Design a protein around this ligand. Structure first.
Ligand SMILES: [Cl-]
Ligand SMILES: [Cl-]
Ligand code: NA
Ligand code: NA
Lengths: 113, 113
């Protein structure tokens, strides 16, 4: 609702963007993601290449960060780093809460500078 | 133009937000900022309290980061930390470039977790 309007705005900004972005609901479900995000996490696991070449460790780390973000309350945000397929990334997460205490979290990812 | 539309979207997302955000043009001019950002940097210098209690060192650091962001090209982004009035902050910067090679940079700031 007001969540849908928020999503439409994120989409307007990020739909054609090189910056991988997504928005997830309280059930860890993606409710918005752009092409860049889809492509980033579409890399097939290469389990033998190294410990960062599968999604599972990073998934738990990122889900854990997201839970922390949800817990910090409306407007809470932070930036952290993680490794994925041999590259270092940063991720910013932000808590957006709505009048019905519905919580969504914005993810924005970049390659580490 | 297309910059104005981008700005309208950022405004829709961040106008009522606790998250300090701004957008600056190539001449280091603010073309959008929300209330949270205005309030953050409205703190009067307290030059005697410590080296982080004035805007000048952080201004040069942040302007330097911004120039790097501009140089990295469309879609470039990174997260860094800085100190201001005795607190640690993170800042994410993102390069948004338009078809006429007009460059704007989004700033998003948070208190360090
Ligand atoms: Cl980190
Ligand atoms: Cl830093
Ligand atoms: Na909370
Ligand atoms: Na460049």
């Amino acid at each position: 609702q007001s969540v849908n309007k928020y999503i439409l705005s994120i989409q307007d900004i990020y739909k054609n963007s090189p910056v991988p972005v997504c928005v997830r609901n309280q059930s860890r479900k993606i409710i918005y993601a752009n092409g860049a995000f889809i492509e980033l996490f579409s890399k097939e696991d290469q389990p033998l290449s190294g410990d960062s070449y599968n999604r599972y460790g990073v998934e738990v780390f990122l889900s854990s960060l997201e839970l922390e973000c949800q817990s910090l309350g409306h407007g809470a945000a932070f930036c952290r780093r993680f490794n994925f397929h041999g590259e270092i990334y940063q991720i910013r997460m932000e808590n957006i809460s709505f009048d019905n205490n519905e919580i969504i979290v914005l993810w924005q990812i970049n390659l580490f500078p």
